[PDB]
Amino acid sequence: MRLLNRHSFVVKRKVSEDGHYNEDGDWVASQDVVSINCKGNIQPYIKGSVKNGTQIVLPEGIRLTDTRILFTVAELRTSDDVDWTEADIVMIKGHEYEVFMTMDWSEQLAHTSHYEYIIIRRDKMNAVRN
């Protein structure tokens, strides 16, 4: 019973890596997004500044943010400006997450090679298309 596959989530990958800038000037993300279940371990990230499940009392309201670490064997990507990659979205309890920062232990050992990801909850924002 590997702990590396305890939790099971759904990842949205922008498979059709297009991500072009329209003639007007705005950003048009990939039109084709697929959602396939993966497996991994999601744990709170405890390191100094990083805040987990912390409500921030702004003079505009109360915003909530969190940062979890993700141990998994899947090769989730992150937004890259050279290969025109556009990150991966993890889901916990419905809320969308983003894979900022990556550690790549892919080849090192035999039965223990794994990726470590830092997933961050996406802030609430009004959505406009382009």
Binding site: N126, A127, V128, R129
Partner: protein, 108 residues
């Protein structure tokens, strides 16, 4: 009072064809501050001085848009009528507003 036969004949030239939703009241200017795109609405034949929509109409409203008032148009871009829907609606994500029944009537 006016005659129903007259009321039927007078209403046979309106023929609205497209419907457009506005966030603000278009009475002052029905040519401004549009939200959706012109979507076809087909009306019935004049009966008892009251025309009605034949089939339901689905208008795709973009995201972060509000619809509060509606307007009808004809082939030559001439706003025959304006009105207000039941209540304002805010579509956070891209949604659809369905028109269940439009009944232009003159029978007071």
């Amino acid at each position: 009072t006016l005659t129903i036969d007259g009321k039927n004949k007078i209403l046979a030239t309106l023929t609205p064809t497209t419907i457009v939703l506005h966030n603000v009241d278009p009475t002052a200017d029905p040519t401004a501050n549009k939200v959706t795109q012109p979507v076809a609405i087909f009306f019935s034949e004049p009966n008892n001085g009251l025309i009605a929509s034949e089939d339901t109409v689905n208008i795709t409203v973009p995201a972060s848009a509000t619809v509060s008032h509606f307007s009808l148009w004809d082939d030559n871009s001439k706003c025959v009528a304006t009105g207000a829907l039941s209540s304002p609606q805010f579509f956070a994500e891209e949604g659809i507003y369905v028109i269940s029944s439009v009944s232009i009537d003159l029978n007071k």
